[PDB]
Specification:
Length: about 290
């Protein structure tokens, strides 16, 4: 409990009347830690301005019964960011849980998801218009960073994987469609169910932005151990409606192809050799 103690100190220091009676680590990424405090509050911390701006925009503008974080505590500085909000109660959706649900239960969950996405994507985003993300341009810039750093030391197999991806990226039309506000990390580990297996809450709008509409289906369409599966995403797309399903799948496939490169780039930017090695190894796994 050393981490817990430092974070208890920081919370009490920056939020003057707040008393920490209990505190435990509830999740962690590679450069963030999330804490459950007093069995009631979530504090996300990092060594978060946009994320806060997004919860504020959404809590003003969304009409939905699905719960999202409502920021009550914030401290934001160059060196440290903390966001605190009341824990949304529920069970996180998993493949295992989904497989035990009746067909009707599954259908209601899919409809709840489609409905939420439709409402969010339909919001007039003028008041959040600073939060724009261009994925194609971001990729080009990450490629330039590769070229400026480690590209010349990569193997021919690694180089070909990258150049083949850039060729595909250049030819695709999937970045030319509707833009809207997306969650942009819409995976089942961010989806909470209530006791009837109905969608009750959504978390982690940390990557959210004005971006391609296709983006919020990337994980719903993913075939992996962590996600439900492609059929889940297809059905949600049909319920959501007025969207080109083949292009949504093309978008997901291109993003999936990019993953190893994204991993390499993260390692370069954050000076973490482990990630550079992991992404390069994953290129070999995918090639063979
Ligand atoms: N049940 C519950 N758990 C929460 C809540 N908020 C966060 N969590 C838990 O804490 C984990 C981390 O929260 P999350 O917003 O995803 O943060 P992160 O993804 O680790 N950090 P970042 O989004 O900055 O990279 C979640 O996966 C979940 O376990 C909440 O409202 N309810
Ligand atoms: N762990 C192995 C899986 C296999 C499939 C691959 N597509 C990826 O899939 C996960 C994907 O990475 C997850 O997003 C993480 O990563 C993103 C960037 O990479 C971050 O911006 C994001 N905020 C972070 O939480 C997603 N939430 C759930 C997906 N199952 O890894
Ligand atoms: Cl390496
Ligand atoms: Mg998360
Ligand atoms: Mg996140």
């Amino acid at each position: 409990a050393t981490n817990v103690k430092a974070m208890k100190y920081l919370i009490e220091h920056y939020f003057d009347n707040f008393k920490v009676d209990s505190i435990e680590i509830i999740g962690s990424g590679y450069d963030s830690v999330a804490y459950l405090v007093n069995n009631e509050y979530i504090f996300k911390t990092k060594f978060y301005a946009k994320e806060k701006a997004i919860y504020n925009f959404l809590n003003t503008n969304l009409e939905t019964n699905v719960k999202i974080p409502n920021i009550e505590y914030s401290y934001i500085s160059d060196e440290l960011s903390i966001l605190g909000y009341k824990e949304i109660k529920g069970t996180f959706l998993t493949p295992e849980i989904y497989s035990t649900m009746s067909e009707e239960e599954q259908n209601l969950l899919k409809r709840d998801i489609a409905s939420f996405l439709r409402q969010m994507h339909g919001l007039d985003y003028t008041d959040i218009s600073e939060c724009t993300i261009d994925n194609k341009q971001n990729v080009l810039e990450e490629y330039i960073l590769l070229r400026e750093t480690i590209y010349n030391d990569l193997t021919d197999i690694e180089k070909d994987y990258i150049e083949s991806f850039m060729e595909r990226l250049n030819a695709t039309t999937v970045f030319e469609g509707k833009k809207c506000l997306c969650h942009n990390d819409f995976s089942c580990n961010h989806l909470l169910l209530d006791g009837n297996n109905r969608l009750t809450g959504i978390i982690d709008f940390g990557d959210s932005g004005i971006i391609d509409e296709y983006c919020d289906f990337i994980y719903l369409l993913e075939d992996s151990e962590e996600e439900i599966g492609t059929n889940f995403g297809e059905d949600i797309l049909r319920m959501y409606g007025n969207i080109d399903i083949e292009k949504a799948k093309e978008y997901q496939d291109i993003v999936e192809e990019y993953y190893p490169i994204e991993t390499i780039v993260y390692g370069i930017k954050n000076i973490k050799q482990e990630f550079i090695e992991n992404g390069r190894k994953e290129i070999y796994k995918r090639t063979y």
